Design a protein around this nucleic acid. Structure first.
Length: 952
DNA sequence: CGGGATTTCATC
RNA sequence: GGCGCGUUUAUUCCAUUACUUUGGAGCCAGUCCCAGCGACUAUGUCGUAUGGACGAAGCGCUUAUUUAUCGGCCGAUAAGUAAAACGCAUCAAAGUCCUGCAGCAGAAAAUCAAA
DNA sequence: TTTGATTTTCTGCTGCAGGATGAAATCCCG
């Protein structure tokens, strides 16, 4: 059958196994700790078993909770202190936390800097730079840089990176010796969480050696982010200089007096970031007000200034908690609107004749916003004002009052609903967002009364209300639940934690987990002989740096008021993988338990119908013996064709490009798109009935898509294994994916399918390249198999130029092929939001009615571009995302199967001596892709003539 | 003078 | 989608240890009860079960409490209450986790000194 | 998105960093 575990069994039997290197492929077993509610669930089976194991003792729970609280508080205190230090001195901190090179390089330094880049915070002295040229694995010389000082105490190996003027390049979690500062009593630093928070009731060693990493990792990450952003800030400022200069030139071309507001330079505080971003936003608003719409100048003509993004915030401390409070900001908005209500009332009541229509231009929605079931608050506010104007005439004095009454009623109702929801147990972010939109529209309309009288006051009010609107939209999802972690830096005797089993019979084992992190607790680890096992006793093993295993015996008391005892709860497959695996067992050392965690996160309990915290044990198992890249030989190929109606059509072929029948065409996940469409229809119905859907449809589409992806991946892997085959994908940059107007991150699955197969082959120890491959996606999906011709836009330009009218009508040719200029093309106009069908010949006649003799090249370049767009939309080789049409010969068959075969044939093409000759020609400085296109077309035609006979 | 830690130092 | 239920997800031995999910299948989706949308015939009604709250989600086999058709209390046939040997719809899959920041995937409003 | 012209709009939750541990010298203890 098709089981992933049978595939893994064959893979294990397919080749020899060898022990893992310095670090093995990490894998986490996430089990759940036996709890009283777990036992309650277990007791209610129809076929009740003989023995129900005991739950976890209450003392263990209390001790674990106290330990988690202490660890969290210690981490918070340490990060707070180091945030204060950073807020005092950035340079010294980021110089200290720089990760030194390993204290093992005894290579002789040869070339110092031909100097004053940074300074060691210990001596505040400049760090000399030294280079070192060596020979790498593949023959490319590499240049490294290191920092050493005149002080023997400061003779470290701080990393330096070149630029074209130097940077650190590394930030570690163990560079700064955290132990000697806040734990040991000899140091007199005023911060000592162990002596202060825990009251000398917690063990020093393990807790400190965990806190060190648990804080310095985050510190190093933030320092890396900031030290990387510091250079891009300067470069972005430099680019903005030229962009502003060009914009000023364009503005002065029309004789426009540019406002005297200048760009703040690259700052190093977030206040400067905010000021520069506000200046940029105001400049963009002014340009949109005066140039984009007034002059009908498009966006290509205006390269704008850039806002500042990418400046990080300090971990766990600069995470804003929104202390300004939601209701306080709402009341501030109310007060500001009430103060500025008179200004808007006077402006609208005392409006001129024709100025009334232009005053309401932003308030009225166009077809684009109206057709999509719902409009922004500004649009509906304008429509309500239009209704009031229709109902009560031009009496805007009372119209404003009635509109204020309606908006105030809606605001009060929304506020009451929000308070009622948020008081007891619930929260309504949708209502908050709607109320915020209403308040924003009301504030805009109210303060629009000062658009031409008091410019600065109006702008200040606008900025304040906009930032208040942003804060009111952002604050509600601040969350209240955070994970709690309890690290175990390693599994050795010192750390006083171990995994134990009961030697029942020959192989059966009971499972207990013991935590010893308190002073006064008793836990004895006794070394024993290899086969001294006895019943009612716990036994375990230990790992060693030299590859030795030294099993030991555990003895303790179940009523100890200090230690923590954990019974587990898991399933057969998990036990066969980690706990009681048959082939790779922890006794031999093939499977190793390196580190674990006591993660406590909220999970849904169906018995209580609620989400409650549930202790997990993220036992990270490092597979110490993996497969060897010694017996693997791809051969057969499985060309995967992507699409929507058919999730995947796969074509089999040999390593001669000759397809063979062993199943030849297989389709997996049929009608699943119909289920996706049904789910989408239900969601759209729920939106039409309220504007949103519930949590039942939260991930139905996502879950179905992921299930389809994983099932298809399993099927592909089984086919590859059973046929000794390989899979063909494309070479796409990281982050590849389509983003239209309604795209979701879950459709970036081609790369994610590659990644899933990569991870699955990676836990077994082999890279993705063994059975997963990529094709150079240059013109791969743009080729047909009947003519060997790949369409380019130069041919489109030639077709546009050649377009003329003969006795039978318009005529144009591609590669000498006469094309009947006839037929109708359908387009989806966003202004109409419907289907409009136009005739190519009729539109050409209409466009040429302004010219003589139908010479398109004699028209304006805009008319030629429009004719080019018409010809391209008529002669597009990809009319639909799921349809391909051959422009040259139009051989007729099932398109998807032919495309599936052609994908594999293209991947085969992406290795040839023709490509070698193309590379040699490209070494002549002719960096043109047209040579590649010609070579690929010629090679494909030659191969079609020789062995790749098209369908007969 | 070993139990028995106990911490402290240290380190890809 | 709401409720339940277990199956298989290991080649001779490694829990029929249950966890975290998705499917197949079995049953059930009504109550403006409160609040978002159109007409707004105006802050009034209707509808679109939308967001939450509210019930909602098998059958028989084996063992005792609810009766006499029979002779001067014996079982004749069956209810549900319980246990549980239990049989059917009911049969299939996969898992590698943490901390921090917030950010990365676009295109249609879009033409000029339009190279 | 895939040949030359481009950039403020409305959508939605993942994309980049940091990783997954034994000697040494002491101490409480006489």
């Amino acid at each position: 059958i098709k089981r992933i575990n049978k595939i893994r069994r064959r893979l294990v039997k397919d080749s020899n196994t060898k022990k893992a290197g310095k670090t093995g492929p990490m894998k986490t077993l996430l089990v759940r700790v036996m709890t009283p509610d777990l036992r309650e669930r277990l007791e209610n089976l129809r076929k009740k078993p003989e023995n129900i194991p005991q739950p976890i003792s209450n003392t263990s729970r209390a001790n674990l909770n106290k330990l988690l609280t202490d660890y969290t508080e210690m981490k918070k205190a340490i990060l707070h202190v180091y945030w204060e230090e950073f807020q005092k001195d950035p340079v010294g901190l980021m110089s200290r936390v720089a990760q030194p090179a390993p204290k093992n390089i005894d290579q002789r330094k040869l070339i110092p800097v031909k100097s004053s880049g940074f300074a060691c915070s210990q001596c505040c002295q400049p760090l000399y730079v030294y280079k070192l040229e060596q020979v790498n694995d593949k023959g490319k010389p590499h240049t490294n840089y290191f920092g050493r000082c005149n002080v023997s105490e400061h003779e470290r190996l701080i990393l330096l990176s070149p630029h074209k003027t130097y940077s650190l390049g590394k930030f570690g979690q163990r560079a700064l010796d955290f132990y000697s500062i806040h734990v040991t009593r000899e140091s007199n630093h005023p911060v000592k969480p162990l002596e202060q928070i825990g009251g000398n009731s917690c063990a020093s060693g393990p807790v400190g050696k965990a806190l060190s990493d648990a804080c310095m990792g985050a510190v190093a990450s933030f320092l890396t982010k900031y030290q990387d952003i510091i250079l891009e800030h300067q470069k972005v400022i430099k680019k903005n200089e030229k962009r502003l200069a060009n914009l000023k030139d364009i503005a002065s071309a029309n004789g426009l007096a540019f406002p005297k507001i200048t760009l703040p330079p690259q700052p190093h505080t977030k206040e400067g970031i905010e000021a520069y971003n506000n200046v940029v936003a105001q400049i963009v608003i002014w340009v949109n007000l005066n140039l984009w719409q007034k002059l009908k100048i498009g966006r290509d003509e205006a390269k704008p200034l850039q806002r500042l993004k990418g400046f990080p915030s300090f971990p766990l401390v600069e995470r804003q908690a929104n202390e300004v409070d939601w209701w306080d900001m709402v009341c501030n908005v109310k007060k500001l609107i009430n103060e500025k209500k008179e200004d808007g009332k006077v402006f609208w009541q005392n409006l001129a004749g024709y100025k009334r229509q232009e005053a309401l231009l932003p308030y009225l929605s166009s077809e684009e916003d109206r057709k999509k079931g719902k409009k922004f608050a500004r649009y509906q506010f304008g429509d309500l004002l239009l209704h009031l104007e229709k109902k009560h005439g031009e009496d805007w004095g009372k119209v404003y009052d009635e509109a204020w009454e309606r908006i105030d009623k809606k605001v009060e109702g929304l506020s009451k609903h929000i308070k009622l929801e948020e008081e007891r147990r619930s929260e309504d972010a949708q209502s908050k967002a709607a109320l915020t939109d209403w308040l924003r529209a009301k504030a805009s309309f109210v303060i629009e009364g000062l658009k031409e009288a008091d410019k600065d006051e109006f702008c200040r009010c606008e900025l304040k209300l906009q930032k208040w609107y942003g804060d009111l939209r952002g604050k509600p999802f601040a969350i209240e639940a955070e994970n709690s972690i309890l690290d175990i830096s390693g599994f050795s005797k010192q750390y006083n934690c171990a995994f134990i089993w009961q030697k029942d019979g020959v192989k059966k084992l009971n499972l207990y987990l013991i935590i010893n992190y308190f002073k006064g607790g008793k836990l004895r680890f006794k070394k024993i002989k290899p086969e001294a096992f006895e019943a009612n006793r716990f036994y375990t093993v230990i790992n060693k740096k030299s590859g030795e295993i030294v099993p030991m015996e555990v003895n303790f008391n179940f009523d100890d008021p200090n230690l923590i005892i954990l019974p587990l709860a898991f399933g057969k497959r998990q036990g066969r993988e980690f706990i009681w695996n048959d082939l790779l067992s922890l006794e031999t050392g093939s499977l190793k338990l390196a580190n674990g965690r006591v993660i406590e996160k909220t999970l849904y309990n169906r018995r209580t119908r609620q989400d409650e915290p549930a202790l997990f044990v993220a036992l990270t198992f490092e597979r110490r013996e993996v497969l060897d890249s010694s017996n693997i030989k791809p051969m057969n190929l499985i060309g995967i064709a992507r699409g929507e109606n058919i999730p995947a059509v796969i074509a089999l072929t040999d390593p001669e490009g000759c397809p063979l029948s062993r199943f030849h065409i297989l389709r997996i996940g049929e009608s699943y798109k119909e289920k996706q469409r049904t789910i989408q229809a239900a969601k759209e119905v729920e939106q039409r009935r309220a504007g949103g859907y519930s949590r039942k449809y939260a991930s139905k589409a996502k879950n179905l898509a992921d299930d389809m992806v994983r099932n298809t991946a399993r099927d592909l892997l089984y086919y590859a294994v059973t046929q000794d085959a390989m899979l063909i994908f494309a070479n796409l940059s990281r982050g590849f994916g389509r983003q239209g107007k309604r795209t979701f991150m879950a459709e970036r699955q081609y790369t994610r399918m590659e990644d899933w197969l990569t991870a699955k082959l990676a836990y077994e120890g082999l890279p993705s390249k063994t059975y997963l491959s990529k094709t150079l996606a240059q013109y791969t999906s743009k080729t047909c198999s009947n003519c060997g011709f790949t369409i380019t836009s130069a041919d489109y330009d030639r077709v546009l130029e050649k377009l003329k009218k003969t006795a039978t009508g318009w005529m144009t040719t591609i590669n000498g092929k006469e094309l009947k200029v006839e037929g109708q093309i359908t387009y989806y106009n966003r202004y109409k939001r419907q289907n409009v069908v136009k005739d190519l010949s009729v539109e050409l006649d209409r466009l040429s009615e302004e010219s003589v003799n139908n010479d398109i090249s004699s028209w304006t370049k805009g008319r030629s571009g429009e004719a080019l767009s018409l010809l391209k939309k008529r002669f597009s080789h990809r009319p639909v995302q799921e349809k391909f049409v051959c422009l040259n010969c139009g051989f007729e068959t099932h398109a998807a199967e032919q495309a599936a075969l052609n994908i594999a044939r293209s991947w085969l093409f992406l290795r040839s001596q023709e490509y070698k000759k193309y590379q040699t020609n490209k070494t002549t400085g002719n960096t043109d892709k047209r040579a590649f296109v010609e070579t690929w077309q010629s090679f494909y035609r030659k191969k079609l003539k020789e062995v790749w006979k098209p369908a007969v």
